[PDB]
């Protein structure tokens, strides 16, 4: 599809998801990376809100490119979006990223944005926090952004 | 005594939700409550962490006591515990609450807990912000709270 894809068979949807993905319309037209780590754990991050953010056209939302032997993974993806806010952020989760190897119990990859409100920025700042592979399931790599969007 | 406990078995358990945890153990004989909502939905909503909050032995994390009857629903319970944190925020979730009747395809209720840093208080203004009962799955109810502990 063109856009984010929510859980639910269409009129069986939250009208307060609805409400947010419409919220951040602004943001679909651009694109986000960030490259951090060091050798041989160098990665490039690219993010885009509901659009294609890889090169496979396999429904990508954010995907990790390993600088070393150029290899993207898809970290999650856009058809398997969650949306919901606080009262000055909003959290963005692509679920549905290509499974792990060696870790997590082989479970599909998670991407988790965490967007807080910066009024003086549509969008700015989008940078890798962290990744949660240690655990048994429910793993998770984590993303922060700031955008005046996300201000009530 | 009993604790919050995380998923996996104990020696593979994430050493980083275990650190959180120790994180938050100033907090842990603390009580939290809220009434919102309005008649006949008025609710008194407590919150514990990592220690029972319910009157019944029920291993609950965060209660809802509806104000006309004195029934008590159980949200979420600290022994199907989730914990991460952000740059200046940590994310507290309680799974295993009571099943919805005629929501959430019967699913058991989960609570969200968005701590946000604060370095003027420890543990401050506890509040419900919303309770998401309209998706097929996932639903949620999210609450929000101020604590030093989530400054870094
Ligand atoms: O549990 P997994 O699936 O084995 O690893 C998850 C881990 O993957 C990414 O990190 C990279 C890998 O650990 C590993 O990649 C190998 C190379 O791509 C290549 O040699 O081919 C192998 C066979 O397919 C790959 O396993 O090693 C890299 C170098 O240390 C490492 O960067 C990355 O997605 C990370 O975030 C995931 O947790
Ligand atoms: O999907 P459910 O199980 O039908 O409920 C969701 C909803 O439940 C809670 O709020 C209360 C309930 O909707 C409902 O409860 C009944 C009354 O408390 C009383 O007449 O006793 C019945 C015994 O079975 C209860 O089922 O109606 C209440 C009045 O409007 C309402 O407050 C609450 O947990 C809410 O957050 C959940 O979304
Ligand atoms: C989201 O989109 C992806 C991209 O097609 C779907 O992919 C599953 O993809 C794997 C290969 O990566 C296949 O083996 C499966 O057969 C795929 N699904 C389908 C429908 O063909 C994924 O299923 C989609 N998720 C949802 C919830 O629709
Ligand atoms: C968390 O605690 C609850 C409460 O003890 C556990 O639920 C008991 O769950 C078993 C199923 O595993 C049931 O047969 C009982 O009837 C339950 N009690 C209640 C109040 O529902 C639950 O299993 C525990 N979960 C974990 C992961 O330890
Ligand atoms: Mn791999
Ligand atoms: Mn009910």
């Known amino acids: 599809?063109?856009?984010?894809?929510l859980v639910?068979?269409?009129?069986?949807?939250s009208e307060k998801e609805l409400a947010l993905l419409k919220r951040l319309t602004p943001l679909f037209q651009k694109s986000f990376?960030?490259?951090?780590?060091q050798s041989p754990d160098m990665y490039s991050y690219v993010f885009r809100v509901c659009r294609e953010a890889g090169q496979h056209s396999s429904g990508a939302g954010l995907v990790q490119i390993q600088k070393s032997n150029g290899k993207e993974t898809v970290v999650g993806r856009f058809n398997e979006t969650q949306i919901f806010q606080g009262s000055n952020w909003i959290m963005l989760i692509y679920?549905?990223?290509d499974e792990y190897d060696n870790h997590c119990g082989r479970e599909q990859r998670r991407?988790?944005?965490?967007?807080?409100?910066?009024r003086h920025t549509l969008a700015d700042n989008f940078n890798?926090?962290?990744?949660?592979?240690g655990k048994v399931q429910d793993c998770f790599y984590l993303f922060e952004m700031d955008s005046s969007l996300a201000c009530s």
Not at 8 to 13: A, D, I, L, V
Not at 33 to 37: K, M, R
């Open 1 to 5: 599809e063109k856009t984010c894809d």
């Open 8 to 13: 639910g068979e269409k009129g069986k949807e």
């Open 33 to 37: 990376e960030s490259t951090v780590g």
């Open 95 to 97: 679920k549905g990223g």
């Open 111 to 118: 991407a988790v944005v965490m967007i807080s409100c910066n």
């Open 128 to 133: 890798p926090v962290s990744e949660e592979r």
